[PDB]
Design a protein around this ligand. Structure first.
Ligand SMILES: *[C@@]1(O)O[C@H](CO)[C@]2(O[C@@]3(O[C@H](CO)[C@@H](O)[C@H](O)[C@H]3NC(C)=O)O2)[C@H](O)[C@H]1NC(C)=O
Ligand SMILES: *[C@@]1(O)O[C@H](CO)[C@]2(O[C@@]3(O[C@H](CO)[C@@H](O)[C@H](O)[C@H]3NC(C)=O)O2)[C@H](O)[C@H]1NC(C)=O
Ligand SMILES: *[C@@]1(O)O[C@H](CO)[C@]2(O[C@@]3(O[C@H](CO)[C@@H](O)[C@H](O)[C@H]3NC(C)=O)O2)[C@H](O)[C@H]1NC(C)=O
Lengths: 58, 50
């Protein structure tokens, strides 16, 4: 949404562009646009969503 | 000087003008071709037009 995807080698995070404050990639700070066959530079990773743990607690 | 891949920087700049960044990545080849041809036009304009 705002920021960039940064990896310290083995774990992917979202940070704001001007101050390194890392946060886990999640559905509330990244948006989605189609499938990923058109983008060059894609990397596979998990986008953990916050509703699934609450729903799985049921 | 902090370096960013030029594509991601162009995405930054599209966010700057109001267009979302996915528009660049989905259309990166087309945008590259437009920029290259636009630079090519300048050479004709300078060399030929007096
Ligand atoms: C990477 O850059 O950042 C990860 C941040 O999650 C780092 O992974 C965690 O590191 C802390 C501190 O060492 C550990 O307590 C955690 O167990 C570990 N894993 C998770 C899932 O939180 O992971 C990771 O170590 C780090 N890698 C490098 C090379 O710096
Ligand atoms: C990145 O920007 O540049 C890499 C250059 O190594 C790129 O990976 C591959 O590297 C081999 C090395 O011999 C080249 O022969 C390949 O052409 C090159 N692949 C491409 C697509 O150029 O790795 C890497 O792909 C490229 N990353 C992106 C997102 O373009
Ligand atoms: C990404 O994380 O996951 C994709 C899904 O499996 C991965 O795409 C696979 O690529 C291999 C090799 O090109 C193909 O043999 C598989 O058929 C293909 N899977 C699908 C569902 O299309 O695509 C993709 O490679 C992987 N990213 C990386 C960098 O490995």
């Amino acid at each position: 949404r705002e920021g960039v995807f940064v990896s310290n080698g083995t774990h992917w995070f979202v940070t704001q562009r001007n101050f390194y404050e890392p946060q886990i990639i999640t559905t509330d700070n990244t948006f989605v646009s189609g499938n990923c066959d058109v983008v060059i530079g894609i990397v596979n990773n998990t986008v953990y969503d916050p509703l699934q743990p609450e729903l799985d607690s049921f | 000087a902090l370096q960013i891949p030029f594509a991601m920087q162009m995405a930054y700049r599209f966010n700057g003008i109001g267009v979302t960044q996915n528009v660049l990545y989905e259309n990166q080849k087309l945008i590259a071709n437009q920029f290259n041809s636009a630079i090519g036009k300048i050479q004709d304009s300078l060399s030929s037009t007096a």
